[PDB]
């Protein structure tokens, strides 16, 4: 019930930001990797910038122990603002990217 | 038929090496991200090594234009042998981690 809502919200949010970024197969291109079974939601870019290999995680979220872990954020917390608007309590949102020491 | 076989093959391969390497939430741990709808298959590790943030792609495969793109590999091409044994021809395997101009040096596809 709660997890269904949390899943729907993450997918809509990640899809919004992915589409906002992008409106040959080797130029740096964005890829969305959504796994509903494992609750893993990731947006990366991959390709070549001349001779330089590009392989960079832009946005990464997961659901574990009924909470949303923001592992990588490209939005300056705009995604967290959207989660709060979607009724997700802040205690169910963890900032994986900021060290455990700063949360307790 | 070609695509469904390729999907099954690369999902079976990614899970094999994933299980083979690792058989609570803040520690550096491995995560598998399979997207059959978009044909994106990824294995990464993520967490904290003390104050050090770890967020590293281990294995990344995608199916694009009827070909398997190995974008990141941790097996020193051991996964290629498994694909050839599954009847995937070398012309349908692209080493995305090799620069486009380097691909013709090996026995695999350029694009």
């Amino acid at each position: 019930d709660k997890l269904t809502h949390y899943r729907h919200t993450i997918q809509e949010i990640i899809k919004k930001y992915y589409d906002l970024s992008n409106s040959l197969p080797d130029t740096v291109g964005d890829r969305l990797i959504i796994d509903e079974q494992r609750d893993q939601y990731l947006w990366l870019c991959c390709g070549w910038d001349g001779k330089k290999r590009v392989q960079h995680i832009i946005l990464y979220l997961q659901i574990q122990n009924g909470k949303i872990w923001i592992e990588e954020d490209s939005t300056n917390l705009a995604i967290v603002d959207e989660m709060l608007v979607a009724g997700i309590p802040q205690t169910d949102i963890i900032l994986g990217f900021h060290h455990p020491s700063k949360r307790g």
Side-chain angles (χ1 to χ4, degrees), chain A residues 1-11 13-51 53-104:
Chain A
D1 188 316
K2 191 191 72 170
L3 290 173
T4 310
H5 186 66
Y6 285 19
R7 285 183 178 95
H8 288 213
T9 308
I10 298 318
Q11 295 187 238
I13 290 169
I14 198 170
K15 288 167 189 183
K16 175 187 171 172
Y17 287 93
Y18 173 83
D19 291 345
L20 208 166
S21 170
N22 60 38
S23 306
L24 187 68
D26 295 311
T27 55
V28 180
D30 296 306
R31 299 87 186 278
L32 196 58
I33 321 187
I34 294 178
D35 191 336
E36 296 192 58
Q37 292 197 339
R38 280 162 277 251
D39 282 307
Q40 301 293 320
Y41 308 91
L42 182 152
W43 163 30
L44 59 63
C45 68
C46 179
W48 296 83
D49 179 6
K51 65 180 179 170
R53 176 48 160 170
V54 175
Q55 190 177 258
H56 171 75
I57 297 171
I58 301 174
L59 201 55
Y60 175 40
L61 310 197
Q62 66 168 350
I63 303 178
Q64 56 181 0
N65 285 62
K67 297 193 177 189
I68 300 172
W69 289 68
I70 307 182
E71 309 292 13
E72 184 64 32
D73 180 28
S74 53
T75 78
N76 304 305
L77 304 180
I79 62 173
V80 174
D81 196 60
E82 291 174 15
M83 290 170 198
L84 298 175
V85 177
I88 303 186
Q90 67 179 319
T91 46
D92 283 9
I93 306 176
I94 305 299
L95 298 185
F97 61 87
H98 260 79
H99 202 267
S101 60
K102 297 97 170 185
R103 307 173 198 167

